[PDB]
Scaffold this active site. Structure first.
Site, mmCIF file in Angstrom:
data_model
loop_
_atom_site.group_PDB
_atom_site.id
_atom_site.type_symbol
_atom_site.label_atom_id
_atom_site.label_comp_id
_atom_site.label_asym_id
_atom_site.label_seq_id
_atom_site.Cartn_x
_atom_site.Cartn_y
_atom_site.Cartn_z
ATOM 1 N N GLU A 122 -3.039 7.457 5.930
ATOM 2 C CA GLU A 122 -2.236 7.005 4.784
ATOM 3 C C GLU A 122 -3.145 6.377 3.720
ATOM 4 O O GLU A 122 -4.018 5.530 4.055
ATOM 5 C CB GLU A 122 -1.100 6.087 5.235
ATOM 6 C CG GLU A 122 0.260 6.479 4.629
ATOM 7 C CD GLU A 122 0.693 7.888 4.980
ATOM 8 O OE1 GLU A 122 0.442 8.810 4.170
ATOM 9 O OE2 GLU A 122 1.239 8.083 6.076
ATOM 10 N N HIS A 123 -2.810 6.684 2.468
ATOM 11 C CA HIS A 123 -3.500 6.241 1.235
ATOM 12 C C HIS A 123 -5.018 6.460 1.406
ATOM 13 O O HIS A 123 -5.791 5.599 0.956
ATOM 14 C CB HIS A 123 -3.066 4.811 0.862
ATOM 15 C CG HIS A 123 -1.642 4.688 0.409
ATOM 16 N ND1 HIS A 123 -1.247 4.888 -0.910
ATOM 17 C CD2 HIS A 123 -0.517 4.347 1.084
ATOM 18 C CE1 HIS A 123 0.055 4.695 -1.017
ATOM 19 N NE2 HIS A 123 0.529 4.355 0.190
ATOM 20 N N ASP A 148 -0.034 16.359 0.007
ATOM 21 C CA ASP A 148 1.346 16.887 0.183
ATOM 22 C C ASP A 148 1.323 18.359 -0.206
ATOM 23 O O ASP A 148 1.814 19.177 0.563
ATOM 24 C CB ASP A 148 2.367 16.002 -0.549
ATOM 25 C CG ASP A 148 2.313 14.525 -0.154
ATOM 26 O OD1 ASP A 148 1.688 14.197 0.919
ATOM 27 O OD2 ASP A 148 2.891 13.692 -0.908
ATOM 28 N N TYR A 150 2.141 2.461 -6.273
ATOM 29 C CA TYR A 150 1.246 3.572 -5.856
ATOM 30 C C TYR A 150 0.050 3.623 -6.807
ATOM 31 O O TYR A 150 -1.078 3.510 -6.378
ATOM 32 C CB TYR A 150 1.995 4.895 -5.723
ATOM 33 C CG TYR A 150 1.143 6.048 -5.256
ATOM 34 C CD1 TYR A 150 0.355 6.765 -6.145
ATOM 35 C CD2 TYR A 150 1.149 6.449 -3.930
ATOM 36 C CE1 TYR A 150 -0.437 7.824 -5.720
ATOM 37 C CE2 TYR A 150 0.354 7.502 -3.485
ATOM 38 C CZ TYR A 150 -0.453 8.192 -4.380
ATOM 39 O OH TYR A 150 -1.245 9.225 -3.948
HETATM 40 O O1 LIG Z 1 -0.762 8.719 2.295
HETATM 41 C C1 LIG Z 1 -0.304 8.279 1.020
HETATM 42 C C2 LIG Z 1 0.277 9.491 0.333
HETATM 43 O O2 LIG Z 1 1.346 9.059 -0.493
HETATM 44 C C3 LIG Z 1 1.976 10.339 -0.765
HETATM 45 O O3 LIG Z 1 3.354 10.234 -0.915
HETATM 46 C C4 LIG Z 1 1.269 10.968 -1.940
HETATM 47 O O4 LIG Z 1 1.992 12.062 -2.494
HETATM 48 C C5 LIG Z 1 -0.049 11.433 -1.239
HETATM 49 O O5 LIG Z 1 -0.967 12.002 -2.188
HETATM 50 C C6 LIG Z 1 -0.723 10.249 -0.534
HETATM 51 O O6 LIG Z 1 -1.314 9.359 -1.506
#
Ligand SMILES: OC[C@H]1O[C@@H](O)[C@H](O)[C@@H](O)[C@H]1O
Ligand SMILES: O=C1CCCC2=C1C1(CCCCC1)N=C(Nc1nc3ccccc3o1)N2
Ligand SMILES: Cc1ccc(C)c(OC(=O)c2ccncc2)c1
Length: 391
Positions: free
Chosen positions: A42-43, A185, A235
């Site tokens: 994640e992130h 994604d 974000y």
């Molecule tokens: O893992 C965090 C993710 O958050 C998603 O929703 C975003 O579309 C991805 O690019 C990534 O940043």
């Protein structure tokens, strides 16, 4: 009865019917592109890190036919779409380019058409349908971008690479939906394969297709059925935060930065800044272990990394919410749950739980009546990416 069944034959059926009714004729093309659950990573995508998503049986289908008249005519039958359900526009030219606005769902199709690299692109009629819960954190927007892109390749074959198509879809997301996303994604919606997770290296753009090869186990996805305000707002803040560190540590990306590096260089950056990079640089390592855990069938290490991944998201990255915190702490209490975390961008959306297929139906009793809000469940087989059916 909270568990939503995919019904994919039905979704294509409804799309065909609504096309015939709307345009006076049988559609010539069907395409699909899936939503996604991120198992861990994640992130990390936008920090040139590693992610381990798999594609869902939840998808977006376009059914459609080329037009001669150089215009685009769209119907969406998705319940959550903002009004109107229909939009028509001419193809962009050197003279006139598409522009985002109303309705918002159309912005994704417009963006992909605006940045489609091949020519000549003819106009088209299409019905848009989705079983991906709209803004519920499983990438509805990436699946509609990639379903669009896949439809356009049937109209005008591109001569390009998987990453070129992901960056097109990612550009539409940036320019037309005002969301400066990484590549995860789109990449997963393009490259997913049934019965596989996809390890993405967002520095090199190498990809590995990793079998999901214990059927003894499942991934349960839990829709918290919330989106907090801070979602959209935060974000980019995080993203800008990660980039300030990279400035200050003379690194071109956090990828290049390792936890020994960051601990020795605190003085150089903010207390927030240090804790943002502590997730990322932390997370990237945990993924690489989680990939290598998955291959060895070491479900229990992948589990534990997952919880670390949640705790870093919740405490260091601060992109969880009480509802997610509570679905995770609630899942992690159930014996035979290896791990649970928020998935996707956070501030709402879904959790992803790794557990025994026999243990999963214990959870959906338990989560529903021990979850503050309303749970929806998906029991996710790992699915195919973008697909074409000629009609
Ligand atoms: O893992 C965090 C993710 O958050 C998603 O929703 C975003 O579309 C991805 O690019 C990534 O940043
Ligand atoms: O408003 C937001 C906030 C940001 C997250 C986001 C939503 C909305 C945007 C447009 C309509 C309302 C919900 N939609 C998506 N994605 C999406 N809309 C689709 C329509 C048809 C088929 C597939 C689709 O996927 N994402
Ligand atoms: C991270 C990890 C590590 C090990 C295993 C076995 C995993 O799960 C699957 O192999 C699997 C998941 C869902 N449906 C079928 C199979 C997942």
């Amino acid at each position: 009865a909270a568990l939503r069944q995919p019904q994919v034959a039905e979704l294509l059926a409804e799309a065909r019917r609504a096309f015939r009714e709307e345009f006076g004729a049988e559609p010539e093309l069907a395409v699909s592109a899936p939503g996604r659950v991120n198992l861990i990573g994640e992130h990390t995508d936008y920090n040139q890190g590693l992610v381990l998503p798999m594609a869902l049986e939840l998808m977006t289908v376009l059914v459609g036919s080329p037009r001669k008249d150089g215009l685009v005519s769209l119907l969406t039958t998705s319940e959550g779409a903002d009004e109107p359900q229909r939009l028509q526009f001419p193809l962009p030219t050197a003279q006139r380019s598409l522009e985002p606005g109303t309705p918002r769902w159309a912005n994704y199709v417009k963006g992909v058409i605006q940045y489609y690299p091949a020519a000549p692109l003819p106009g088209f009629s299409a019905v848009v349908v989705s079983s991906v819960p709209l803004g519920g954190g499983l990438s509805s927007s990436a699946s509609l971008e990639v379903a669009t892109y896949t439809f356009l390749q049937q109209l005008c074959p591109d001569s390009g690479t998987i990453a070129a198509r992901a960056q097109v879809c990612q550009q539409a997301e940036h320019s037309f939906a005002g969301m400066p996303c990484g590549i995860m994604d789109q990449f997963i919606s393009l490259m997913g394969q049934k019965g596989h997770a996809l390890l993405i290296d967002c520095r090199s753009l190498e990809t590995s297709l990793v079998p999901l090869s214990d059927p003894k186990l499942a991934v349960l996805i839990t829709n918290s059925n919330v989106r907090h305000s801070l979602a959209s707002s935060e974000y980019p803040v995080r993203r800008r935060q990660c980039e300030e560190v990279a400035r200050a540590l003379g690194a071109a990306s956090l990828r290049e930065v390792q936890l020994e590096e960051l601990e020795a260089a605190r003085d150089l950056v903010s207390k927030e800044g240090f804790r943002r990079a502590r997730h990322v640089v932390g997370e990237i390592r945990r993924t690489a272990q989680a990939a290598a855990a998955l291959r060895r069938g070491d479900y229990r290490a992948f589990g534990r990394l997952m919880v670390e991944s949640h705790r870093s998201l919740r405490d260091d990255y601060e992109v969880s919410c009480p509802e997610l915190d509570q679905l995770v702490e609630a899942a992690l209490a159930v014996p035979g749950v290896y791990g649970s975390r928020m998935t996707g961008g956070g501030f709402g959306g879904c959790t992803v739980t790794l557990l025994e297929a026999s243990a999963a139906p214990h959870a959906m009793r338990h989560i529903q009546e021990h979850y503050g809000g309303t749970a929806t469940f998906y029991l996710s087989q790992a699915a195919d990416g973008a697909k074409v059916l000629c009609l």
